[PDB]
From a paper:
At the cytoplasmic face of the NPC, Nxf1•Nxt1-bound mRNPs encounter the cytoplasmic filament nucleoporins Gle1, Nup42, and Nup214, which specifically activate the DEAD-box helicase DDX19 to remove Nxf1•Nxt1 from the mRNP8. DDX19 is a member of the DEAD-box helicase family, which are RNA-dependent ATPases composed of two RecA domains (referred to as DDX19NTD and DDX19CTD throughout the text). Gle1CTD plays an important organizational role by providing spatially separated binding sites for Nup42GBM and the DEAD-box helicase DDX19/scDbp5. A comprehensive structure-function analysis of DDX19 indicates that binding of Gle1CTD•Nup42GBM induces a conformational change in DDX19, thereby stimulating its ATPase activity.
To understand the structural basis for IP6-independent DDX19 activation, we determined crystal structures of human Gle1CTD•Nup42GBM in complex with DDX19 in the presence of ADP or AMP-PNP•Mg2+ at 3.6 and 3.4 Å resolution, respectively. The heterotrimeric Gle1CTD•Nup42GBM•DDX19∆N53 complex exhibited similar conformations in the presence of ADP or AMP-PNP•Mg2+, with the auto-inhibitory helix still bound between DDX19NTD and DDX19CTD. The Gle1CTD−DDX19CTD interface involves 40 Gle1 and 35 DDX19 residues to generate an interaction interface area of almost 1300 Å2. In the first interface (interface 1), Gle1CTD residues of helix α4 (H495, E491, and Q487) form an extensive hydrogen bond network with each other and DDX19CTD main chain atoms (residues 380–382), as well as a salt bridge between Gle1CTD residue E491 and DDX19CTD residue K385. In the second interface (interface 2), the acidic C-terminal helix of DDX19CTD is recognized by lysines on the Gle1CTD surface, with salt bridges forming between DDX19CTD residues D470, D472, and E475 and Gle1CTD residues K416, K419, and K479. To gain further insight into how Gle1CTD•Nup42GBM binding facilitates DDX19 activation, we compared the structures of Gle1CTD•Nup42GBM•DDX19∆N53 to those of apo DDX19∆N53. The most apparent difference was a rotation of both DDX19NTD and the auto-inhibitory helix away from DDX19CTD, despite the auto-inhibitory helix still being bound between the two domains. Therefore, we considered our structure as an early intermediate state that forms immediately after Gle1CTD binding to DDX19, but before release of the auto-inhibitory helix and separation of DDX19NTD and DDX19CTD. In summary, Gle1CTD binding to DDX19CTD causes a cascade of conformational changes that partially releases the auto-inhibitory helix and prepares the residues involved in nucleotide binding to form the closed, active conformation.
Numbering used by the authors:
A (entry chain C): 379 to 423
B (entry chain B): 384 to 698
C (entry chain F): 54 to 479
């Protein structure tokens, strides 16, 4: 009796610093969009 | 390779399934053909019945498949049939059911962009109850349309051009080759369906567990397809009819991060196609901009024409 | 019989142009006057409010027939015209555009007059005026047809009139509702059906004869019949002529098959096994008798298969409604019996079924029907499918006969082995 949780977003941790700096930027950089989905903290950046 | 490794996992896992019921297909007895006949029949008719009229009756088809697949007897043409007839049958119906979902997306959804949603919900719902069926869908979906992975087939040495087009998903008889236009639609309808499955959920059933193939696979698809050089006509086409179908659901989920992606392709990835595409093939790339110029300034991506509404679910 | 109803239905269901690859023939009054050709609406230099309405209703550039018709009609001096092009090429939108160019809404009296064969068709033509001319404030429309109640001493103030042939004559001739000498443009829409009534032909000419000589005379017809062409010359003096030959349809891309069956219950069992054998989206079934069609559709519905039934008793608008749903994907199978027998421009039709063979009166093969039924499915390179149900040796005799005329093989399909049925639609 357990229900798993959602992977819709990726945790802020367990994420490389490259991807972290991409999500934080006002503009994305061509050819370097992160494959993992964004985190819940940087949604409204 | 993370994707290519995962890509192979599903493919060879399907090949295992091709072999597990090996002998059900390869049988020539009058009974052995009839059993293969009645199963392939009472397992694909309901999928072809999927209609836009009302979710009120779209539940019959869903129940008829769940019963069929769960082992229960199903009212087929004349006599009722089930899987208990043959033990290697279960693993067979799961194969034919999965292909028909992509096949219905190959022909109907290509022609009819709106039929994608009433078909997907059923697929997304069966995916929940029986995960093994979903891997089989992802198996066929990937093969017939490798652009859904997404990965572009590269050109290996030795210019067997006819041999290469086959890998690109073109359907070619020994003598015949498929036209681009009859091919482009075949692939649109395949990813319009895929773009629909990742955002839709079966309303009924009381399932506290989440979507099997979540909307995360939509982000990676856009990310992974925009980090590689675009094909001339294929990319600018598939990129469009993916956003029209799933762009609304991605804008709500990844509110800002998604917009960042869009402001990129518009000023950074659009130049990447203007040179690649010749003047005789700019048709797709033009729709792709007419799609953004509205959405970019309107701050809103329209709901996909044909989305199942509250009325549809009551009737 | 009743070509107005066929036209009316074709109007309600037509959503866009019918593609045509043929080139347009032009036969100008002065043979050496240069040819008038245009490729965009900007070139014609239309009034701003008009060009506005053109772009408003979804038109990007002139259609093939319009590329030559519009400049010829807008040219000075006013040059008459006789245009021949199949239904759906943009004939109506052409003369509506020409009308709205000559009207000057400041003058409150009829300046443009159109003759439509019936009340219903007049309405459809009227709707196009209202759309394209939505940016002409104070511009109104008057319907001069039977049923329109009017009293003496009243005077039409509308700048455009549309009506049936028999009543428009009364408007100008006796009741003095219109002064013909102010009419600047005159249209006779759909002459191919106008001639179907002997009364209409004479009433239309008498009207044409009350008009001035500087009045621009225009006539349009879907068919190139001789009875039409002989009738058009009497109506349009010193006419230019524009022709666009009807788009031919072929079986280059379709695969023809047939199935032998002992009876009708077998034709139904044969039909069931086909489902699930291949990827069939939607499909049309043509039947011989209404008694059988209602049975099939009922039998098909019994299986839980969702179906649409088209029968003759249904009203015209009712027929359109079912067809619309079919296009919208509400229904996946359309069973019909001589109602719209030629084949509908549904896009999602994976297969055409001939539960009973296209039979002409007298018991001959209806090749035009067979062609049109299937020609729609695979035009311009698309792929299509065909299946013919044979229930007797007489029906079989007809089948080879069709195979003769087209000289293309209708192979046999055995419905017992699914493995064989999968091969054809791959
Ligand atoms: N230039 C155009 N561009 C786009 N659609 C058009 C154009 N002209 C007509 N249509 C559309 O095509 C359909 C058939 O128009 P058309 O005038 O009306 O037929 P017909 O030649 O039988 O009178 C209508 O739905 C109309 O809106």
């Amino acid at each position: 009796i357990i229900a798993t949780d959602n992977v819709l977003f990726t945790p802020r941790d367990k994420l490389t610093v490259e991807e972290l700096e991409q999500f934080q930027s006002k503009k994305f950089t061509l050819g370097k969009i992160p494959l993992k989905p964004p985190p819940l903290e940087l949604l409204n950046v | 390779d993370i994707t290519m490794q995962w890509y192979q996992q599903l493919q060879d896992a399907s090949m295992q399934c091709v072999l597990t019921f090996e002998g059900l297909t390869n049988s020539k007895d009058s009974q052995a053909k009839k059993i293969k006949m009645d199963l392939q029949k009472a397992a694909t008719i309901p999928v072809s019945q999927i209609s836009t009229i009302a979710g009120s009756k779209l539940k019959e088809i869903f129940d008829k498949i769940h019963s069929l697949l769960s082992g229960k007897p199903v009212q087929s043409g004349g006599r009722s049939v089930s899987v208990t007839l043959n033990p290697q049958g279960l693993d067979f119906v799961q194969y034919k059911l999965a292909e028909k979902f992509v096949k219905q997306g190959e022909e109907e959804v290509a022609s009819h962009h709106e039929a994608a949603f009433p078909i997907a919900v059923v697929a997304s719902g069966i995916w929940e109850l029986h995960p093994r069926v979903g891997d089989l869908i992802l198996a066929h979906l990937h093969k017939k349309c490798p652009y859904s992975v997404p990965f572009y087939p590269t050109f290996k040495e030795g210019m067997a051009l006819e041999d290469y087009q086959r890998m690109l998903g073109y359907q070619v008889k020994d003598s015949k080759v498929e036209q681009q236009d009859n091919f482009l639609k075949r692939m649109s309808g395949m990813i319009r369906l895929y773009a629909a499955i990742i955002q839709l959920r079966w309303p009924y059933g009381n399932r506290q567990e989440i979507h099997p193939h979540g909307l995360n696979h939509g982000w990676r698809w856009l990310a992974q397809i925009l980090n590689m050089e675009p094909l001339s006509d294929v990319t600018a086409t598939l990129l469009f009819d993916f956003l029209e179908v799933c762009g609304n659901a991605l804008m709500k989920q990844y509110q800002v991060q998604f917009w960042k992606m869009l402001i990129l392709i518009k000023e950074d990835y659009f130049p990447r196609i203007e040179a690649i595409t010749s003047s005789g093939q700019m048709g797709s790339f033009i729709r792709l901009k007419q799609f953004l110029e509205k959405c970019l300034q309107h701050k809103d991506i329209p709901v996909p024409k044909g989305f199942l509404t509250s009325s549809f679910w009551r009737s | 019989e009743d070509r107005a109803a066929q036209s009316l239905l074709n109007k309600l269901i037509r959503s866009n142009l019918v593609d045509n690859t043929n080139q347009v023939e032009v036969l100008q009054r002065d043979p050496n006057s240069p040819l008038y050709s245009v490729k965009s609406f900007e070139e014609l230099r239309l009034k701003p409010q008009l060009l506005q309405g053109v772009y408003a209703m979804g038109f990007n550039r002139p259609s093939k027939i319009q590329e030559n018709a519009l400049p010829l009609m807008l040219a000075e001096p006013p040059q008459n015209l006789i245009a021949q092009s199949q239904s759906g090429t943009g004939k109506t939108a052409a003369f509506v555009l020409a009308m709205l160019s000559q009207v000057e809404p400041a003058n409150k009296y009829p300046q443009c007059l159109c003759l439509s064969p019936t009340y219903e068709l007049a309405l459809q033509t009227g709707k196009v005026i209202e759309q394209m001319g939505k940016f002409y404030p104070e511009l109104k429309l008057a319907y001069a047809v039977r049923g329109n109640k009017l009293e003496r001493g009243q005077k039409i103030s509308e700048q455009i009139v549309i009506g049936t042939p028999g009543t428009v004559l009364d408007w100008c001739s006796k009741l003095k509702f219109i002064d013909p000498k102010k009419i600047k443009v005159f249209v006779l829409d759909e002459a191919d059906v106008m001639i179907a009534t002997q009364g209409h032909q004479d009433q239309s000419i008498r009207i044409q004869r009350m008009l001035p000589r500087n009045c621009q005379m225009l006539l349009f017809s879907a068919t190139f019949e001789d009875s039409v062409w002989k009738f058009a010359q009497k109506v349009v003096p010193d006419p230019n002529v524009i022709k666009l030959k009807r788009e031919e349809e072929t079986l280059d891309t379709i695969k023809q098959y047939y199935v032998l069956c002992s009876s009708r219950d077998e034709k139904f069992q044969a039909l069931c096994n086909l489902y699930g054998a291949i990827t069939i989206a939607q499909a049309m079934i043509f039947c011989h008798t209404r008694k059988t069609a209602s049975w099939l559709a009922a039998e098909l519905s019994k299986e839980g298969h969702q179906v649409a039934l088209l029968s003759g008793e249904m009203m015209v608008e009712q027929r359109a409604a079912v067809i619309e749903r079919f296009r919208e994907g509400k229904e996946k199978v359309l069973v019909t019996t001589n109602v719209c027998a030629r084949g509908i421009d549904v896009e999602q039709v994976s297969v055409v079924i001939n539960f009973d063979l296209p039979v002409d009166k007298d018991g001959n093969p209806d090749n035009e029907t067979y062609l049109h039924r299937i020609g729609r499915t695979g035009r311009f390179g698309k792929r299509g499918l065909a299946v013919n149900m044979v229930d007797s040796k007489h029906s079989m005799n007809i089948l080879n006969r069709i195979q003769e005329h087209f000289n293309k093989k209708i192979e046999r399909l055995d419905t017992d082995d699914l493995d064989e049925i999968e091969k054809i639609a791959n």
